[PDB]
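User: Here's a protein and a ligand (varenicline). What would the complex look like?
Assistant: Let me lay out the input and then the predicted complex.
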Amino acid sequence: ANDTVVVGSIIFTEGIIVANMVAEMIEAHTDLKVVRKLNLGGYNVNFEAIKRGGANNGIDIYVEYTGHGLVDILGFPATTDPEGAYETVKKEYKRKWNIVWLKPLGFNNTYTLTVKDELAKQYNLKTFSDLAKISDKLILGATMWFLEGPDGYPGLQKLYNFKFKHTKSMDMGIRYTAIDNNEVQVIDAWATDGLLVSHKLKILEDDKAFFPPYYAAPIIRQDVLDKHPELKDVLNKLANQISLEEMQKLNYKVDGEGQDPAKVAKEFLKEKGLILQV
Ligand SMILES: c1cnc2cc3c(cc2n1)[C@@H]1CNC[C@H]3C1
């Protein structure tokens, strides 16, 4: 009579916004109440938590990215097209873990390598290969998740033979300040990052196609769907409802304009008519 589900996120702006959207949709369209949980860390943290489940100090639902799941299935970085990534993780997670991938939200939040526009013009940079030829002169500032993830810098560095003068691990917001001030020359910008809006940066082309697609989708434990089958349709109301530009704008409302992510998520859903006004 008082059933609850746990929606998890790791700790970054987009993750919390989209987890909040999932929680708001569930509470708007079902009789379930939602525990919102934040998990410390990056790679495989939400995956392990959902394997435990909300009844065992874990989570029942979170928004995963196809490429992050794909690299864990394969055991080595590989590239593919959006459908290849999505269908592979959907079938594998269902068969191995009884985890259900719902429909993609609509955006691809990939890792990138990004430089200031002026630096790109100064050195004629368009591609990762262009950058690698001169990386020995440059400093990379990047997030811990990118530097430590199996699908992040370790394999990219080996494939392109990147040789930066110095490589610094940085918090998410401050790497944008650091590249704006030329404390570093390259950052691992993420494609939906809010602060890409306010900095004059150039996203370089991954010409060897190292990275897989990173399409966000809600995923849920099958036993939670068995108990509450309505969830499937409710969460699929978000299907293709968030473009890259929309997600970027929401992220900037938090990171650039100081709004809290709960407010940003709820007002977005109200604007799009996905939940009721008032
Ligand atoms: C480990 C686990 N999940 C991640 C999710 C994301 C990232 C890194 C992760 N690393 C950023 C790049 N892909 C989508 C977001 C943001």
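Summary: The first strand starts at residue 4 and ends at 10.
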